[PDB]
Amino acid sequence: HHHTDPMVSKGEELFTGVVPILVELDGDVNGHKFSVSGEGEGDATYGKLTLKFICTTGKLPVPWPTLVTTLVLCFSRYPDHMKQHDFFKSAMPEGYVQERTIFFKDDGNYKTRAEVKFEGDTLVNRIELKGIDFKEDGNILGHKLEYNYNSHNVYIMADKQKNGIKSNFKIRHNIEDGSVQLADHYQQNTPIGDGPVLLPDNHYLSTQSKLSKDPNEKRDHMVLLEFVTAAGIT
């Protein structure tokens, strides 16, 4: 609402209230083609997301928790003293590309590319996902993961050469038998536009996610509440 840096003001202004979100994913995992649509709202003031996702092609062929990181970090809450480090909002409204490779230990990998940008007043995240080399009897295609999600801190670093950011981090998915399925993420983000962006000092994001079901919904779906806060600069 009041920042002495006009570049920060420009990005904050687009995220000042509740912003509607649309998520589209087209996926192919070991030749099972599927699509997911999601709708909800983001409130960057509190770092809060609320989304509901539907598999529009029938039953989702992989477990919903494996898609949480893939299915909008511009809604992170950056403390006032860290707002000059917020790459994600500084790239708006033209947006950014978010690319990942996700390696599931002892199993296959996801390769994702997403464009995150405004269409009018709506923040859209449009994703293509390709998954290969998964085991039919593994934890992913065998749906052995529990329907829950662990809190996680992720380290963000600038990539000055690409005018973007980079991160590598591990997600632990609980398996029904009490064990864990590791998912190693590599991520890079680059701006879509050619204007300047804020390139951050090293810092981390703290995330927490809660998964639930809509008791009146017959389609395969996931309801997601996420909180993300930046930290690590004193």
- Alpha-carbon span 83 to 79, nearest angstrom: 6
φ, ψ for residue 33 (rounded to 5)? Answer: -90, 135
Specify the CATH architecture of the domain 6-231: Beta Barrel (2.40)
For 172, the token pair is 């632990």
Cα 134 to the center of its chain, rounded Å: 22
The experimental technique behind this entry is X-ray
Domains of the chain, residue spans: 6-231
Q: Identify which of 226, 207, 214 has the alpha carbon closest to the alpha carbon of residue 49.
A: 226
Do 202 and 157 meet the contact criterion of CB atoms below 8 Å apart? yes
Do 185 and 170 meet the contact criterion of CB atoms below 8 Å apart? yes
φ, ψ for residue 81 (rounded to 5)? Answer: -75, 0
Instruction: Tell me if residue 227 falls in helix, strand or coil.
Output: strand
Do 38 and 55 meet the contact criterion of CB atoms below 8 Å apart? no
Residues contacting 178, CB < 8 A, separation 6+:
none
Q: Resolution limit in angstroms? A: 1.6
- Alpha-carbon span 219 to 60, nearest angstrom: 10
Q: How far is CA 124 from CA 20, 71, 105, 118, in A?
A: 9, 11, 30, 6
- In the chain, after which residues does the backbone break, taking C–N over 2.5 angstroms as a break? 71
Do 136 and 155 meet the contact criterion of CB atoms below 8 Å apart? no
